[model samples]
Target: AHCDHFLGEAPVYPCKEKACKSVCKEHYHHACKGECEYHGREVHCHCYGDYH
Candidate 1:
């Protein structure tokens, strides 16, 4: 499946850092689905704080 935001929208962010598009409403890119080292082991989480 194509990458998507946690809010169920197509990944998009109103910032210059396109990577922010990886930040979901509930979880960060590194903490979502298969991206996280602890994926599927716990509730979704983020990278601690904003990236930009």
Candidate 2:
């Protein structure tokens, strides 16, 4: 598997762009809501809207 952390054999895929973006969609579904960002060990769809 491309992703070391990914534990599976049925699907041979890694956490890369578009692939990760697809993963990102599960969490966030809109551009203003967030964008896909890859962390060294982790990956997430970070939101651009900051209201803190």
Candidate 3:
């Protein structure tokens, strides 16, 4: 199933860090509180928005 906060399949492990002004509501990461990246480039929180 698809996630409301991201594109493609939902992250196997989504970010569980405390919400921040710059954090995405659906922000996900490989490691908790780790950087979010795509195609080898870092991405801003919720960078996908609703375009997905």
Instruction: Report lDDT per candidate.
Output: 0.33, 0.36, 0.33
Cα-based RMSD of the predictions, in order? Answer: 12.4, 11.7, 9.7
Best by lDDT: 2
lDDT for each residue of candidate 3 in 1-52, tens digit (9 for 90 to 100): 2333343222422433233212543443321232344444533333223333
TM-score, prediction 3: 0.18
Q: 1 or 2, which is superior by TM-score?
A: 2
What would the C-alpha RMSD of candidate 1 be, to one decimal place?
Answer: 12.4
In Å, residue 23's CA in model 1 sits off its true spot by: 2.3
How well does each candidate superpose onto the true structure, as a TM-score? 0.17, 0.31, 0.18
Worst 10 residues of 3 by lDDT: 12-21
> How many residue-pair clashes does candidate 1 contain?
0
lDDT score of residue 47 within candidate 1 = 30
Rank by lDDT (best first): 2, 3, 1
| Highest-scoring model, TM-score | 2
| Candidate 1 global CA lDDT score | 0.33
In Å, residue 8's CA in model 2 sits off its true spot by: 25
